[PDB]
Design a protein around this ligand. Structure first.
Ligand SMILES: *C(=O)/C=C/c1ccc(O)cc1
Length: 124
């Protein structure tokens, strides 16, 4: 799937993708509901993070899978965007719960579909 991390229209392009198409992206992609529950989780994200894309669906990202992101800098930005109904933020972050500290770039962007939000990840 020919789509770049950070592209302006990413939410329009990713509205059409099934599981298999999301798995063809060059970067990690997670779709969360407004509470942080995982709706979609692609193969590229599992390759970066070691998590099993099949097992994480239905878990809460902030409570269960990713406690290192339960902080004002990540979760706080997420919830502020859910509350406002708009979200488009990029930042760097370190993942160090199950892994050697690993720095990534994160892009969170409200989806087109209802009650859903994207978290995109790539290595830096
Ligand atoms: C810190 O606990 C981060 C965990 C994490 C980041 C991204 C994922 O896709 C899965 C777990």
């Amino acid at each position: 799937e020919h789509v770049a991390f950070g592209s302006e229209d990413i939410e329009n392009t990713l509205a059409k993708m099934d599981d298999g198409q999301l798995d063809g992206l060059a970067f990690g992609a997670i779709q969360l509901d407004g509470d942080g529950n995982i709706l979609q989780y692609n193969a590229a994200e599992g390759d970066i993070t070691g998590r099993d894309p099949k097992q994480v669906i239905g878990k809460n990202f902030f409570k269960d899978v990713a406690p290192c992101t339960d902080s004002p800098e990540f979760y706080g930005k997420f919830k502020e965007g859910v509350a406002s109904g708009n979200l488009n933020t990029m930042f760097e972050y370190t993942f160090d719960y199950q892994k050697t500290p690993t720095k990534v770039k994160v892009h969170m962007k409200k989806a087109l579909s209802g009650d859903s939000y994207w978290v995109f990840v790539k290595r830096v």
